[PDB]
Amino acid sequence: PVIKVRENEPFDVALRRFKRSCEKAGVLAEVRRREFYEKPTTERKRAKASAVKRHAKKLARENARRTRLY
Template identity: 80%
Template sequence: MPTVKLKDNEPFDVALRRFKRSCEKAGVLADVRSREF
């Protein structure tokens, strides 16, 4: 599972965008969709 640590003075929106991008790179959503019934 990808993790993202907030940097000093980093807005939450930016961290969320980084988290979404790291999930995409790791293939998390594709994996969930493939296991969906």
């Protein structure tokens, strides 16, 4: 996961962020552990869970003003 995508102008330090778009994730991340078939369905699927923090954050900006912290 130095990533095959070539960094603009070649250098000895890979620009690993700017190279990667969806690599290592799922594919080379679960190293040396017993592989389950169906566990992801209940283990991993936390999209619903992260959607709550994004709403909450968009609510609180108006509310800090209404408290006059802002």
